[PDB]
Structure formats: structure tokens, C-alpha cells
Design a protein around this nucleic acid. Structure first.
Length: 51
RNA sequence: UUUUUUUUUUUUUUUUUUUUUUUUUUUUUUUUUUUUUUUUUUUUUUUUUUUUUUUUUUUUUUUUUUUUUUUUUUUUUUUUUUUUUUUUUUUUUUUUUUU
């Protein structure tokens, strides 16, 4: 993601912090991530399939 | 609780390649890192050949005694108060396992 636009990016996530793995317990987050993975596995020719 | 490649974006798979090339060979000559000449023990003055000797000697022996670097006497676990004898023990427990 450092080459997202042209070249410049700064990382906002701490390499040792663990404040985001709680989101795996959320059912809706798992449902949307499974939705996007299932939909973009069917269409691998899309530009946005990098997600 | 759930899990169980400290696997995975999709692609790919020589830490291969401009093209041309291939002795980290070559000016031509040459080919003892041989040579003035003449020599050839890094031998020799002539003598000489124990880095032997004054003579005398020849235990780096000895005063005479002596001869456990033994001994007051008594003794002989560098044992012992009595009691004891896992440098065991509250009870409960017994993966320094587990959402």
C-alpha cells in the first residue's frame, strides 16, 4: 500500500499493538469479508480484485 | 471458546540473456632469470696435532664418640549430656494442560 497513489505513504498501525484482532469476533465483519472474498473470487478479471 | 504449513493478492518460477562473442594468448623477434678472460677444497708461512701434565697425589670420608630427623608418666574411634535417626508431612491435592 505504499504505492497506492504514486509513491508516498506513512504507516498508521503500530507493529506491536493488538487492538484490531478483536474485530474477528464480530459476526458482521466476517460476513462482509466473506462476501467480498466470495464475490471477487468469481470475477478475478476486475481491477479492484486486489482487495 | 475456536483453531492447527511461523502457506497463499493475481500472476509467475535460471539470484540467464542488447547484438556479437569466448586461451583473464600474441608488435616483430626470440627462449639456462649461462658466460670478459682463466680458473674451481668458502686448503696451506714454516712448524706442528689429548682445547693433557710443576712436583706430589686420587671417597667433593673421618676430632673422639655414636646411629628410629622414638620416648615425662599414663593412653589410643581427631565417638558419646540424655533422647533420638527420610536435611518427609497443616489440610487438600498431583500434565510447571486448557476461555
Amino acid at each position: 500500500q505504499c504505492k497506492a497513489i504514486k509513491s508516498d505513504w506513512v504507516s498508521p498501525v503500530t507493529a506491536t499493538h493488538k487492538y484490531f484482532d478483536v474485530w474477528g469476533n464480530d459476526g458482521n465483519y466476517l460476513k462482509i469479508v466473506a462476501c467480498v472474498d466470495m464475490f471477487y473470487n468469481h470475477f478475478k478479471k476486475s481491477i479492484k480484485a486486489t482487495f
